[PDB]
Structure 1
Amino acid sequence: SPYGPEARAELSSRLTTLRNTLAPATNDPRYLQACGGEKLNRFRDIQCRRQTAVRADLNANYIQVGNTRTIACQYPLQSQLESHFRMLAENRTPVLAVLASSSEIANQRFGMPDYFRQSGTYGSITVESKMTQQVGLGDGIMADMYTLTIREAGQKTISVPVVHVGNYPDQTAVSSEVTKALASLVDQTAETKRNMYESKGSSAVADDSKLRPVIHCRAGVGRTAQLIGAMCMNDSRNSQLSVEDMVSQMRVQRNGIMVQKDEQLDVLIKLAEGQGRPLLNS
């Protein structure tokens, strides 16, 4: 009964109500509004909760699901790249997971700069990209890894591991098995990098706002939310956190679209069922 169609319908009903409540009004005080005239939101209807915003000129949010702390963002606009790199560096980012595919990035109508597979200079910031590993995730899905070295006068140089799911499908959801493999790779990559900072005595270890995995697809609400949900289920600290809790938390902390598609929620439900984790709050 806990995972039956009735429970699933009730979960969707609660989440739909929340999405509606969280829909943005004009100049909504809950959502970040552009300063200085630059385009902020890649998608007009996909907004950035103001109180959890990372930077005033990015569509990007701090998210905590149970105990699990991440940043979810949109794919940065070309005009946002310097600020996006500064976000990555200041966060001492232990992994950047990019879930927009190579095909999507290559479609220049989408305006998604190839910012992590090429080197370049963006205002005051110089970035070098290097190819590292490739890890299969199942079903032919491949994670291509990179390291980004981010340099800027007056700033410590930061290297960021990148996990790019270069052949993430855009028309269909990846399975729970692929999602689990992806979450494990992203978590493991982050743990290795965080450990390096710990070993060096970085002050970022004590700061709630830093050392967060950064995750985006195109909008940062669909594939991104599926992955964040899977990651929180991997976290030993999150016993009894329900699917209702996780999705409600993502929605209140970013926007009401988090977990955009029913197919994505289906994966989270299946992962939860595998753990005996509740769907609903009693």
Structure 2
Amino acid sequence: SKQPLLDIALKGLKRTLPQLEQMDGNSLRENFQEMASGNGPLRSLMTNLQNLNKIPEAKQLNDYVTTLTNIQVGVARFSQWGTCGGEVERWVDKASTHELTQAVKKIHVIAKELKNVTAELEKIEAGAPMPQTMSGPTLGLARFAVSSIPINQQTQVKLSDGMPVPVNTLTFDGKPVALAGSYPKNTPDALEAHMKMLLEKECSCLVVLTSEDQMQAKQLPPYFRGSYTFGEVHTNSQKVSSASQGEAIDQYNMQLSCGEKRYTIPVLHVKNWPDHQPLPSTDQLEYLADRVKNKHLPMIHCLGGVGRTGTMAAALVLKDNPHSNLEQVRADFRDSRNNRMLEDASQFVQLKAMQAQLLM
């Protein structure tokens, strides 16, 4: 029976999903009850996903689904949009066009993301090894595809409304060290989620490792400079540090606000750390660590969120326990985000040099 309900789910998503992708607010307000009852796409889709809750072997895939169906869409979890006569129906009836439209967009992106489940089911239709790993969701917000930059779903960061962002909490020898992620995607929604995380997590600070040159050739948004407003969040950051040339480090002061809430956070922008390379001197890495040092963890990112970012975090560990096994650190970090953490050899060399100097 596990194999047949697996096939009920595959054929069901293949045709239900493209339907949710074509939803429009007006056509929906007028037909929600039908879609959420009998053989309609919304109810039928939620039922098919329940199939995986009956198969203990699909544990990984089930945790993934559960996360998606618990995301808030109106004033309820997405899963409550599969039924009639309850909270969603009451809400939809009196929702304003503006409210209805934002809800419709969430359904579009969640529908699309749910095609990754279709893909796993098709693999099982051929060589059927029940996967024991599933990257967490990206909902159109990640800069890189998960096939190139995977995301550990157990340690992925989640906003208070259920929304997962492309960032992981790194840990070593049993304790968390910092929040690591890739350079934010140039999108209102991608940028809003980012800022939102900084204050909800109350990060001690924000560290940025990409040079001006790279932010150029790749066109990476300088959101930590002026002032902007994404969704319902606005940012005010002013440069506090020195003159012009020799931009070892530029320090800023950031004030964030989401509704009636505010939060202040210092920003450190490193400017002479080339991609795929170490810093100019061991002393510099050692000093940067003390600076950063001076819930409540630092948030760090380069471009991919795996190389330079890994190195920076490991240096924080060394400061407090200089005898720390760097081989163990790399292993624990990889188990916290993905297997590319600290993939550049030359940077691992600089770290061991910082260790040695420090014990001196």
Q: Same fold (TM over 0.5)?
A: yes
Aligned to 2:256: 150
Q: Confirm whether residue 87 of structure 1 aligns to residue 197 of structure 2.
A: yes
Match of 2:138 in 1: 34
> In the alignment, what sits opposite 1:273?
356
Aligned residue number for residue 212 of structure 2: 102
Q: Is 2:327 the counterpart of 1:244?
A: yes
- Does the 8 A contact of 2:142 with 2:184 survive in 1? no
| Residue in structure 2 matched with residue 180 of structure 1 by the alignment | 286
Q: Compute the displacement of 1:42 (Å).
A: 2.3
Give distance in 2, aligned partners of 1:82 and 1:219. 19
Q: In 2, are the aligned partners of 1:134 and 1:142 still within 8 Å (CA)?
A: no
Given the two structures, how large is their TM-score scaled by the length of structure 2?
Answer: 0.57
Matches within 5 A, 1:43-192: 44-55=147-158, 56-66=163-173, 67=175, 69-79=177-187, 80-107=190-217, 110-134=218-242, 142-154=248-260, 156-170=261-275, 172-174=277-279, 175-188=281-294
How far is 1:115 from its partner?
A: 0.7
Give secondary structure in 1 for the equivalent of 2:226.
coil
Q: Is the 8 A contact 1:68 1:232 kept in 2?
A: no
Higher relative contact order (CA 8 A, sep 6+): 1
| Residue of structure 1 equivalent to 2:8 | none
Relative to structure 1, is the Cα distance of residues 247 and 147 closer, same or farther in structure 2, using a 3 angstrom cutoff? same
The one of 219, 233, 253 aligned to 2:318: 233
For residues 253 and 82 of structure 1, do their structure 2 counterparts lie closer, same or farther at Cα, with a shift above 3 Å needed?
same
Question: Corresponding residue for 2:17?
Answer: none
Matched-pair contact (CA < 8 Å) for 2:143–2:184: no
Deviation >4 Å, runs of 4+: none
Alpha-carbon offset, residue 182 of structure 1: 1.0
Q: Is the CA contact (8 Å cut-off) linking 2:322 and 2:358 kept in structure 1?
A: no
The CA distance in 2 between the partners of 1:134 and 1:45, in whole Å, is 38
- 3-state SS, counterpart of residue 157 of structure 1: strand
Q: Does 1:216 align with 2:322?
A: no
Measure, in 1, the Cα distance between the counterparts of 2:234 and 2:227.
8
CA pair 217-274 structure 1, distance change in 2 beyond 3 A: same
Aligned residues: 221
Unaligned runs of 5+ in 2: 1-118, 121-130
Structure 1 vs Structure 2 CA RMSD: 2.4
Measured against aligned partners, the alpha-carbon deviations of 1:9-56 in whole angstroms (never above 9, x if no partner) come to xxxxxxxxxxxxxxxxx8663421333xx1424254112211111134
- Aligned equivalent of 1:17: none
Contact 1:53 1:62 in 2 (8 A): yes
Cα separation, partners in 2 of 1:134 and 1:222, compared to 1, 3 Å:
farther
Deviation at 1:241? 2.8
In the TM superposition, residue 268 of structure 1 has moved relative to its aligned partner by: 1.6
Q: Is the 8 A contact 1:77 1:111 kept in 2?
A: no
Of the structure 1 ranges 57-66 and 46-55, higher mean CA displacement relative to structure 2 is found in 57-66
User: Aligned partners of 2:242 and 2:155: how far apart in 1?
Assistant: 33
Q: Deviations over 1:40-93 (max 9, x none)?
A: 242541122111111344221111224452111111112211000000111112
Instruction: Say whether the 8 Å CA contact 2:209–2:273 is kept in structure 1.
Output: yes
Percent of pairs with identical residues: 28
Aligned counterparts of 1:228 and 1:172: Cα–Cα separation in 2: 16
Q: Give, in angstroms, the shift of residue 276 of structure 1.
A: 5.0
Shift of the 171–72 alpha-carbon distance from structure 1 to 2, 3 Å rule, reads closer
**Hey, which of these two has a bigger chunk of helix by percent?**
2
CA distance 1:228–1:143, shift in 2 (3 Å): same
Q: What letter matches 2:349 in structure 1? A: D
